């Protein structure tokens, strides 16, 4: 979780999604593998961001609308890391992941498995 929520907190902060950054910092500080020192260091950075801007989203991601799972999930495109909104779309004959019909045109080999595209 350290790598995930560090990278998420970083991208959320750079995006000015400081509430999504706050989510990632709460998730980080909860980790039982961390020392009180590390928990405090993450809190110091979170409070620095929160005091200098806010602990709320100035710009909002909305992907949690899938990640709550109740409505189910759209397949995440292996070319872009975003959900496929297309009704029907390309899928890799090897790994069977979907790709957006525009974005797959950029590749000779599947972005996930590096098998030739087909």
């Amino acid at each position: 979780p350290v790598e995930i929520y560090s990278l998420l907190a970083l991208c959320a902060c750079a995006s000015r999604a400081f509430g999504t950054c706050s989510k990632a910092f709460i998730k980080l500080k909860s980790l039982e593998t961390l020392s009180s020192e590390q928990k405090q260091q993450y809190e110091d950075l979170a409070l620095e961001i929160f005091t200098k801007h806010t602990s709320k989203d100035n710009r909002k991601p909305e992907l949690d609308s899938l990640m709550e799972g109740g409505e189910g999930k759209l397949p995440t495109c292996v070319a872009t890391g975003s959900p496929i909104t297309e009704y029907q779309f390309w899928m890799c004959s090897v790994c069977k992941h979907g790709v957006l019909a525009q974005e797959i045109s950029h590749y000779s080999f599947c972005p996930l498995c590096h098998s030739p595209v087909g």
Partner: protein, 938 residues
């Protein structure tokens, strides 16, 4: 009510007439009515020093040990001496023996050695009058209290044959029948007494035996609770208008009230949750009952153990601990205080101290083995230690006791009998199911679960058995068996909150579905809106990372239970995580204005401090200290911590003299804490000594900042006199023995610190510097080399060793220690402390450009980069390392030194060393001075 004017006139009486006994007996009886057991003992003793045969003062001393101290040895020896004065004064007066035995039996707290002395006094009354049924009834009662139900039955049956009209005997016989499970006889005989009751007037005892029969028949809990409410409300109606004389103890019947409390506690929670849960009015009745027994006879220590237990079950674990410490300083051998102290330590996850308090409990009383709650708490401790097989043994030892199962004639259990709490009986079954489950004995867990389903059938606690079936189903992988059981708990049923939390948790774990989790939690909010369910809903939303709905949940709680500081602090956390700082601040201010717990001053202060509003924190903590200081042991320690915290803030205000005055005021309060803690709470002594040490350490720090290093040595010596072996205090007095030129006492504190922890880097490096000052350079090197062989990635020890090797002229030894860091940590090369250590090396080998390159890679780091920057400035000022203006060599080098190429490139390095100095942000006046000096070197 002019007690000071009365005391002055009484002192004038005792001065004019030192022998005049009536004044002292009146003063003693008044002091008991004033609850002043200390001066009641002084007056009883001063009276006994003038009239050693005074039956009332001997009775008052025997009562003191039964009714404040709970001291079995002092109580039994004062009862012996009281009896010997009856042998001296009217030995034939069987009524006086009987009166004494009623008072001491109704107050005894079920102590065997007190009850044996009382029984011999009542047996002497019975040998003087064998015809007296009532003497045989109170022998019957004292045999219930000793667990000798067979002898109680003989003494009540003989009281009935001595007087068939002794309803006292029949009530006691029915109580024996109910303990024996002879329910059909108890029922018929209670109906017979309910017809006769109109000739007697209403008795709380007959309503209580109806409540006990209703409980044993498994009747609805609200009906049993309503009967117990009528028992209390009828019982108190007898006591109206009475003075606090010894007769009040017989009429109050402490022993009977504590049984009533223990079955209210069968319907109460089993967990130390904070206030705001629909069960809590039952604990509120328990507080009122126990408070009457504390107004009168608290040394029936089972009373104050039950107040500590009720405080614990209402979430005040500090008040529970203080009340237990108080019990243990009235009698250190008091086993039940150690039994609840095991539940205090169990709730704190202090499993070792839970086991030690269980072993203390047993060491003081082996008859603790006769209670199922003992075996449950030892099984809980064993289970948390992983001693699963021994937890099976102790739970079987629990189930061996009488009343732990529904059983007929010819019982396998044959020990002395007890009135087992249905919530304990449940818990011992449920934890045997869990301990078999943890042992892999799924069939035995399922078999004992079917026995629990049979045992607790038709009770509210049966829903906890269905939730335990769902828990066993999850361990068995029957997730749909768990969910279907939990779904079969609905809005009209008890325990629906835990059932829906379990449904939520299952859907998040196994189906990965946050919406099924959230809809289960919104079902909790819709069906069972209360402050605890709304608090738990808040915490659920925090685990889900949705703090806005968590704050709605904490609002839905806190508008209903504004007294809960734990909820106000959890509210504060979520509001801080959501930039609602004014709401957090104003909730903490409202909690402080309503006088709530110790840490709320720290929550508000550390918030305002992290928001850099150090002045607001200063004014808040001063306002939190604007009262006249309260003399309660809690309030003294609270104000001591508020003063310490105000001194921590005054440090950032530069108000260091006020910080010393606040710390001395904390030291004054902390001395008043220690001088009570040593007499009423001795288990807190190391923590309270450490807080006194830390106060003295901070006084010493402020005196260092005032350049009074002699006060710094003094107040760190005081910090050692409080705590000789605190790592920071040892290190700081070592620093001051160093700073005031005592390298030997510095080496003593280093050696002691290294003996207490060998891996203390500061002590090793300080000792190595002292070896270097003593010219033991080989030891200085070797101790840093040993520390690097323990800790290869240590840029402080490495950079210290590099300068030792520079000053020795042995730079060739260094590369080993870079390789050791690289071998441990392949990323060490990327770290600013490695880059600083490497930059230092190249400046000494002779490569100023490579030194600059490696310093530059470190230069922004808060320690290593700050120290790298100074060495970049050294090179940028003076890259040839010359005597600036030295005539032996600045008259030379002219073929380069007269060139614009050397001049302009060097002067650019000078004029940009000013920019490296603009990167050296100072944090001290010494930092500003050294910065200003090096700008002036540019």
């Amino acid at each position: 009510q002019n007690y000071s004017g009365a005391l002055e006139t009484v002192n004038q009486i005792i001065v004019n007439f030192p022998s005049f006994l009536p004044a002292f007996v009146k003063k003693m009886k008044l002091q008991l009515a004033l609850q002043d057991w200390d001066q009641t003992v002084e007056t009883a003793q001063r009276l006994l020093l003038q009239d050693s045969q005074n039956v009332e003062a001997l009775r008052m001393q025997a009562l003191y040990y039964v009714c404040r101290e709970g001291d079995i040895e002092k109580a039994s020896t004062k009862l012996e001496n009281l009896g010997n004065t009856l042998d001296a004064m009217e030995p034939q007066n069987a009524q006086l023996f009987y009166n004494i035995t009623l008072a001491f039996s109704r107050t005894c707290g079920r102590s065997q050695l007190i009850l044996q002395k009382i029984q011999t006094l009542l047996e002497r009354a019975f040998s003087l009058n064998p015809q007296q049924s009532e003497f045989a009834t109170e022998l019957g009662y004292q045999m219930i209290l000793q667990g000798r139900v067979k002898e109680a039955l003989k003494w009540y049956k003989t009281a009935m044959t001595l007087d068939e009209t002794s309803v006292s005997a029949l009530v006691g016989f029915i109580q024996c029948q109910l303990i024996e499970g002879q329910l059909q006889d108890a029922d018929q005989q209670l109906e017979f007494l309910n017809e006769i009751q109109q000739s007697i007037g209403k008795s709380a005892e007959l309503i209580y035996l109806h409540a006990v029969l209703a409980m044993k028949k498994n009747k609805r809990q609200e009906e049993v609770i309503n009967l117990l409410n009528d028992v209390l409300d009828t019982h108190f109606s007898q006591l109206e208008g009475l003075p606090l004389g010894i007769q009040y103890f017989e009429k109050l019947n402490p022993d009977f009230l504590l049984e009533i409390v223990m079955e209210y506690l069968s319907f109460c929670p089993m967990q130390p949750a904070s206030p705001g849960q629909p069960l809590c009015p039952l604990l509120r009745r328990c507080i009122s009952v126990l408070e009457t027994v504390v107004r009168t006879v608290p040394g029936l220590l089972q009373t104050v153990f039950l107040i500590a237990k009720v405080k614990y079950l209402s979430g005040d674990i500090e008040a529970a601990f203080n009340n237990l410490q108080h019990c243990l300083e009235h009698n250190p051998s008091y086993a039940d205080a150690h039994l609840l102290l095991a539940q205090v330590y169990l709730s704190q996850e202090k499993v070792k101290l839970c086991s030690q308090s269980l072993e203390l409990c047993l060491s003081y009383d082996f008859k603790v083995r006769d209670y199922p709650l003992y075996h449950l708490i030892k099984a809980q401790s064993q289970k948390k230690m992983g001693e699963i097989a021994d937890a099976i043994k102790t739970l079987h030892m629990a189930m061996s006791l009488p009343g732990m199962k529904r059983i007929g004639a010819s019982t396998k259990s044959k020990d002395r009998k007890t009135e087992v709490d249905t919530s304990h009986r449940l818990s011992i079954f449920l934890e045997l199911i869990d301990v078999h489950r943890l042992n892999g004995e799924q069939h035995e867990a399922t078999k004992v679960l079917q026995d629990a389903i049979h045992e607790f059938s038709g009770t509210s606690e049966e829903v906890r058995v269905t939730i335990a079936n769902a828990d066993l189903a999850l361990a068995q992988g029957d997730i749909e068996r768990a969910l279907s059981i939990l779904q079969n708990v609905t809005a009209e049923q008890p325990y629906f909150i835990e059932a829906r939390e379990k449904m939520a948790d299952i859907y998040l774990k196994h189906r990965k579905d946050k919406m099924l989790y959230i809809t289960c939690f919104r079902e909790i909010a819709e069906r069972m809106a209360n402050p605890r369910s709304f608090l738990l809903l808040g915490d659920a939303y925090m685990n889900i990372l949705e703090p806005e709905e968590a704050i709605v949940a904490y609002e839905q709680a806190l508008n209903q239970n504004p007294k809960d500081g734990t909820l106000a602090s959890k509210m504060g956390k979520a509001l801080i995580k959501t930039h609602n700082y004014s709401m957090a601040i104003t909730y903490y201010e409202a909690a402080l204005k309503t006088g709530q717990k110790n840490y709320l001053c720290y929550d508000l202060a550390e918030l305002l401090l992290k928001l850099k509003w150090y002045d607001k924190a200063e004014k808040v903590l001063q306002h939190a200290l604007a009262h006249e200081p309260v003399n309660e042991l809690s309030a003294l320690m609270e104000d001591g911590r508020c003063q310490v915290l105000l001194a921590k803030v005054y440090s950032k205000m530069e108000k260091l003299g006020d910080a010393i005055t606040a710390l001395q005021q904390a030291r004054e309060l902390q001395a008043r804490v220690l001088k009570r803690v040593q007499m009423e709470q001795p288990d807190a002594v190391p923590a309270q000594k450490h807080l006194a040490a830390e106060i003295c350490a901070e006084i010493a720090k402020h005196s260092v900042a005032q350049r009074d290093y002699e006060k710094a040595i003094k107040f760190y010596r005081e910090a050692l006199v409080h705590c000789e072996t605190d790592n920071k205090i040892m290190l700081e007095l070592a620093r001051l023995y160093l700073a005031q030129d005592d390298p030997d006492s510095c080496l003593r504190q280093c050696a002691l610190l290294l003996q207490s922890d060998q891996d203390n880097e500061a002590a090793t490096m300080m000792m190595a510097d002292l070896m270097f000052r003593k010219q033991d350079y080989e030891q200085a090197v070797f101790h840093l080399q040993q520390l690097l062989e323990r800790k290869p990635d240590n840029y402080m020890t490495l950079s210290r060793l590099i300068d030792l090797l520079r000053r020795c002229g042995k730079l060739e030894d260094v590369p080993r220690f870079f390789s050791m860091a690289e071998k441990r940590n392949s990323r060490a090369k990327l770290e600013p402390g490695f880059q600083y250590c490497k930059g230092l090396y190249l400046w000494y080998t002779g490569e100023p450009n490579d030194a600059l390159r490696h310093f530059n890679k470190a230069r922004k780091d808060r320690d290593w980069g700050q120290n790298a920057l100074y060495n970049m400035i050294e090179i940028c000022l003076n890259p040839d390392n010359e005597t600036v203006g030295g005539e032996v060599f600045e008259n030379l080098d002219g073929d380069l030194g007269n060139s614009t190429e050397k001049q302009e490139s060097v002067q650019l390095a000078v004029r940009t060393a000013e920019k490296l100095l603009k990167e050296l942000k100072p944090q001290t006046v010494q930092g500003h001075v050294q910065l200003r000096i090096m700008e002036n070197y540019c």
